[PDB]
Amino acid sequence: MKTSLCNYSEFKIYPARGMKFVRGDSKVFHFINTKVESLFFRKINPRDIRWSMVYRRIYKNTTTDVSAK
Amino acid sequence: MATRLQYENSCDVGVFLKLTNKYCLVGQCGSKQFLHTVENRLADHIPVVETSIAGTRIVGRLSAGNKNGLLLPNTCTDQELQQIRNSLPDDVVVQRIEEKFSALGNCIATNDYVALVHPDIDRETEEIIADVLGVEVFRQTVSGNVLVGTYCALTNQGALVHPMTSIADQDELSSLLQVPLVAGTVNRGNECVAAGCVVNDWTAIVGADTTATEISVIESIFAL
Amino acid sequence: MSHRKFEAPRHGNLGFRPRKRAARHQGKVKSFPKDDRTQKVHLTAFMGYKAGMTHVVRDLEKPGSKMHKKEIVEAVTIIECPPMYIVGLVGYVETAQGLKTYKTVWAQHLSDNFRRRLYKNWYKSKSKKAFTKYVKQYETEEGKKSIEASLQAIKKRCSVVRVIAHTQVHKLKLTQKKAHVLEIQVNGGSIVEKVNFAVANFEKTVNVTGVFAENELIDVIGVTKGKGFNGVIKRWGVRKLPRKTHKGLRKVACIGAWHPSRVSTTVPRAGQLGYHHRVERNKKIYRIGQAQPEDGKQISTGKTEFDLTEKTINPMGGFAHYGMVKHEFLMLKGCVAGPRKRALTLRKSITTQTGRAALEKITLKFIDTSSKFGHGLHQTAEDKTKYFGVKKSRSTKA
Amino acid sequence: MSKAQAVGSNYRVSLGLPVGAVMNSADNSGAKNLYVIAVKGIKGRLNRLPSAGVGDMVMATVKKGKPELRKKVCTGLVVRQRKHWKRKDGVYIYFEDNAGVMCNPKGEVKGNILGPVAKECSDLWPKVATNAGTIV
Amino acid sequence: MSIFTPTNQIRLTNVAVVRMKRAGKRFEIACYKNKVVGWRSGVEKDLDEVLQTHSVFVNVSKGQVAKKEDLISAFGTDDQTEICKQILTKGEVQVSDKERHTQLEQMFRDIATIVADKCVNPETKRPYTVILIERAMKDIHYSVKTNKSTKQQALEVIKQLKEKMKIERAHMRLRFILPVNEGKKLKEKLKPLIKVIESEDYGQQLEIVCLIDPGCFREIDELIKKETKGKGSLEVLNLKDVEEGDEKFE
RNA sequence: CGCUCAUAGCGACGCUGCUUUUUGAUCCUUCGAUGUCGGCUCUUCUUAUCAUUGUGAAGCAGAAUUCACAAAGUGUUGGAUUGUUCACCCACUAACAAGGAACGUGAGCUGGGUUUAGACCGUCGUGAGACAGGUUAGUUUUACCCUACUGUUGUCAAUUGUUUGCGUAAUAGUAGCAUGAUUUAGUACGAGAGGAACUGUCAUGCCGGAUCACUGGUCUGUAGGUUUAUUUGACAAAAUAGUGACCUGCCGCUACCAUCCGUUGGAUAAUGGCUGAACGCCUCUAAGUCAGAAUCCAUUCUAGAAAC
RNA sequence: CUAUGACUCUCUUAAGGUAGCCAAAUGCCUCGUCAUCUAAUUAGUGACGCGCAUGAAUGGAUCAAUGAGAUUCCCACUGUC
């Protein structure tokens, strides 16, 4: 497959990297890093985390353009 | 009419081949005899794609469709999709559906005017499906089961259900779909109707173990 | 203590048994490919330098698989192959007791190729310095005749000639400027034919593109990555002994029976790990290319849009300050001997193979780049991080 | 037995459930657990536990369930595992829990499968694929 | 403390043991497994062969020999050979290590034999496998005995399952339709195997025979005709059942 | 016996051998001391070959099985019970063959047992005590010597004048083995039930040799953050808590926990044949010759000789 | 009813194992048998008990609390694997 969005943040998951995780509720998630996996496990919202692109998206820093190149 | 085929000597050929009112999807995982034989019997008119969906052997019950729309899973590859698009002439909406909480084949049985579903499926997804196929989707399930595309095999003129289905349920189904039902089961080792066969209003590809008597019944129901 | 085994399926292979450090750092063996191929399309070998790895997405094209045409992520080793200078020809005649070296002809046209030849190729106490010491013709005409005679000799005699070639290491980013010299045996044609071709190539260089193709298999030879004196568990792969821990642990328990009052040449034991030759055969190759500098700006890692945006195959920050590819490289499929800046010699396959994956043409899609040092694809990555800015650093901006 | 798949057998999917692995029954049957006794198609080594990735046929026993099934070695299929694995795609998938299903010796699931079924498994066993809700 | 060798604590011999207890003292002797039986049957083989050792034991497992003091307190004599004979004659057989194993097997054998003689499945008269029969007999529950005869026990077993299930305790009769050319060979297999009656042989017509055999033997019969002939063979019931077998009560 | 039929396969009553993987027999060595049992670990060797290779018999139609030869090249498992070898079961498997090496392997381990002293019970004994009966608790010392092996320098004290380069390659080692699926094919075969094979294709088990682009582990990078107790007056920033703890974590190292790769000629055995006598015919054999094994030897791969 | 042997007789040597208990730290045979616990149990437990060679202050049976005592099982945890 081709490039995908992270489903925790809004990072570029290129097709050679990251981790896919499938829940029992039949939902799936990419994860650019283990760092974000950990966060997910914890239940720390990405709207807290300034490293995340959803934070940047919702507090306006023009991060959506670099996520579509 | 009923034609006995087997995909790598497996009697469950309904999961490796999709038959619809128009168009046909065929799986490929090194099954050379099957690919050519399905071209020799459709209607010398209905084309074939010979293309995997989600890189998987299953195709017949990973996708659902009629002639006015086609449903694909969220995990389907773009390249694969392109091929499908190419192979299906412009009279149909080839839409990759955004439903990942259930499959687009085991959980959906459909014909050209009505459809069947999970009673579980999200609302938005259902709506999308309705828009695509151009048919009345309504929430109903066969007894003892929540999957319908596993245990029901619908066409326009006829339809099947699994042999444990109660009479009342069957009646209800008939009322809803406006399609004549029958409790006969292909193979007779398998409970599923969708596993052993996919069907069409003109033709029917069926499992190898399926009995001579059994095939007659199915033929009758669809009026082949 | 009844017997009672049955078995212990032998740990390690004894076809590598002496398990010591390799002498030749480049890689070398008695074996080249068999003779009488085609003259100069078969120059037989070359010498690269390994410059990291990347992954690379491509379309598979085997029949009968799960999906014939589908994207797969195969790793890929990238080796710089700066053009090799030929600088000599060696006649090399068959005899009863071997193939002794007959006569050697060196190129008198350039002396600077021997001023490339610096240290490890000349030690009269040398050290990033050539004092100028090379023995050739300084007799103008008389010497010339001698050379000619020598050449004639090596044409006459039932030989298989080889050309003394060397690499351009001064061209690379590496700190050494002492040129690695390896003979590459010339195949094809008559002996005479070979010799006259060899002579021609003296003043000139040869490229990796000339020797190897982009889809053909390569045998990569080089000394393996050094792990030093290691124990029997890492070196041979025997089971750890039991217990939370008892009076050893990382040991073969028993090293032998009584009655042979000696201990076997064949029984695992802690000496050295990992600096010995070896020759990984049948490496598919994907690209033999060169990025932005020469070979077009469009085809630097594949043309823009499909085949990905245009850029060097260098990841961001190069290859982990262990290189940065700027001369013609060679994308061998996953993993070859040695670290991230070791001189690998490359040989053509001893037998030319025509099975699956030798004749299979293959076309890349994405050669991707580092996102633990960035976010991939260079400028985009830079842009993305810029927006983020910094709260955590070693500076809170109080 | 059977196996009839697919056409190779995958494209291996990593050791995850050794023997003595308890996993979820994820199937409409009496079983809640499935203790893995051994895995079909395991030629040994010498102190190496047989292991089941995904789509492995697994001789198992119901540790906890209804007593009509218990105390009885029985054939099952590992349908998803918590231990991650690399696919063709490139991506590494892993699931929320270790889980199997009940089946005939030929690989015929008679119930309908609960939870995600894992694409590899679907590719392998046709019956399993049929009875899956979610293959993703 | 630590020795260079074992202390040696094994006197276990694996030959058969014949036990006789008298005067509050157990006496044993080393004989062979087959020879004791022979002796008790009345077949001579001298005392040299039947006895593996000619000295009287207290315990053959422990290897404790009986003293003259003890021997004379029980039998009224201290001569060991004579005592051995007595032990052999009036004493009962005792299981050694080997014999224990045999004992385990024995029960299995008995059940296999006694149960599989006469029965058919409920509804109609057809042959069926031994495993099923065994299961049936377990359901109703039966305990085999070496003190009773096997034949006797068969009757008992069938008694239980005549009350519970529909079974066949007697013979049945078959009718085969053989060809003239290919049937001769078949006939010669069948003739010594079971009783042939109503044998009507023709040249212009097909050969007809009728048999007398138990309910489980039909399968055996039909099968051997097909592979020997190399064609299908018509099996018909002359009677569904007939008297005698275990119905006459032997 | 094997419907028939001594020897397809078995084989009475007999007889002839071999082996030292049984237990005895004996007492030759060892009692100023050869550490007993089993297990784990590891290597090598044997063939009396369980599987795999090539073959030949069969009561070999097919599938399946049994019998024999060349073959020891490669494999020969996970477990419950027991100190147990042995035993018996469950499960996998192509197969789960038998064996040796001081009953291989205690300065390799363990010490479960045997096998000291404490103690309990049973039987015996007046008793002290006995038990080759059961139970429970009970120190496992020393290599730094020599050789052997693994690797490492170094002398070839002319390395053939010195230092050095590119090579050669004697000799030694040597690795890939095996499976499933599918096409073949529901074809051959068969009355049907059932049900092949050669080649091709795709995957896998075990083994081996590498590697680290990915994923996962690791974290003294004491890299950044969090936070506990204390200390520096507070803030701040530090320290101490032998790295205070926790989260994240590159570089690196590493994992069938990830990835890549693992060749082709000749000569034979078994056997099947050829031409062909001796023996007018005959005959694979005597002269001669052909095919042919997972064999062997090279190729390849590892080392590189008081060898060039 | 020949099983079982109350009963009777006699002998050794005074009487002849009562209530209980048990393959028990006491049972050779023995990996006893039956049930249960396991996929599988020479283990464990509950029953049976002509008990080689249990048994009444040589104390028998029972047993709360306690046990750096012995044994078996399951849950959790776990680089034991």
Curated annotation (Swiss-Prot), chain A:
It comes from the Eukaryota. The keyword Ribonucleoprotein applies. Signal peptide: none annotated. One of its GO terms (biological process) is cytoplasmic translation. GO terms for cellular component: cytosolic large ribosomal subunit. Keywords: Ribonucleoprotein, Ribosomal protein. The keyword ATP-binding does not apply. GO terms for molecular function: mRNA binding; structural constituent of ribosome. Belongs to the eukaryotic ribosomal protein eL24 family. This is Large ribosomal subunit protein eL24. It comes from Dictyostelium discoideum (Social amoeba). The gene is rpl24. The chain holds residues 1 to 69 of 127 of the full protein.
From Swiss-Prot, chain C:
It holds the Pfam family Ribosomal_L3. GO terms for cellular component: cytosolic large ribosomal subunit; extracellular matrix. Keywords: Cytoplasm, Ribonucleoprotein, Ribosomal protein. The L3 protein is a component of the large subunit of cytoplasmic ribosomes. Residues 17-28 have a biased composition (Basic residues). Belongs to the universal ribosomal protein uL3 family. Residues 1-34 are annotated as: Disordered. It is found in: Cytoplasm. This is Large ribosomal subunit protein uL3. GO terms for biological process: translation. Its main location: cytoplasm. Residues 1-10 have a biased composition (Basic and acidic residues). PROSITE patterns: RIBOSOMAL_L3. GO terms for molecular function: RNA binding; structural constituent of ribosome. It comes from Dictyostelium discoideum.
Swiss-Prot record, chain D:
Keywords: Ribonucleoprotein, Ribosomal protein. One of its GO terms (cellular component) is cytosolic large ribosomal subunit. GO terms for biological process: translation. Pfam families: Ribosomal_L14 (PF00238). One of its GO terms (molecular function) is structural constituent of ribosome. HAMAP family: Ribosomal_uL14. Belongs to the universal ribosomal protein uL14 family. This is Large ribosomal subunit protein uL14. It comes from Dictyostelium discoideum (Social amoeba). The lineage of its organism: Eukaryota, Amoebozoa, Evosea, Eumycetozoa, Dictyostelia.
From Swiss-Prot, chain E:
It comes from the Eukaryota. It is found in: Cytoplasm; Nucleus, Nucleolus; Nucleus, Nucleoplasm; Cytoplasm, Cytoskeleton, Spindle. Widely expressed. Keywords: Acetylation, Cytoplasm, Cytoskeleton, Disease variant, Nucleus, Ribosome biogenesis. The modification N-acetylserine is found at residue 2. Changing residue 169 to C: In SDS1; uncertain significance. Changing residue 87 to S: In SDS1; uncertain significance. The keyword Cytoplasm applies. One of its GO terms (molecular function) is ribosome binding. One of its GO terms (cellular component) is nucleolus. It holds the Pfam family SBDS_C. InterPro entries: Ribosome_mat_SBDS_CS, Ribosome_mat_SBDS_N_sf, Sdo1/SBDS, Sdo1/SBDS-like, SDO1/SBDS_C, SDO1/SBDS_central, Sdo1/SBDS_central_sf, SDO1/SBDS_N. GO terms for biological process: bone marrow development; bone mineralization; cytosolic ribosome assembly; hematopoietic progenitor cell differentiation; inner cell mass cell proliferation; leukocyte chemotaxis; mitotic spindle organization; rRNA processing. Its main location: cytoplasm. Transmembrane segments: none annotated. Changing residue 151 to N: Strongly reduced release of EIF6 from pre-60S ribosome subunits. Belongs to the SDO1/SBDS family. Associates with the 60S ribosomal subunit. Interacts with NPM1, RPA1 and PRKDC. May interact with NIP7. Found in a complex consisting of the 60S ribosomal subunit, SBDS and EFL1. Interacts with EFL1. Interacts with CLN3. PANTHER family: RIBOSOME MATURATION PROTEIN SBDS. This is Ribosome maturation protein SBDS. The lineage of its organism: Eukaryota, Metazoa, Chordata, Craniata, Vertebrata.
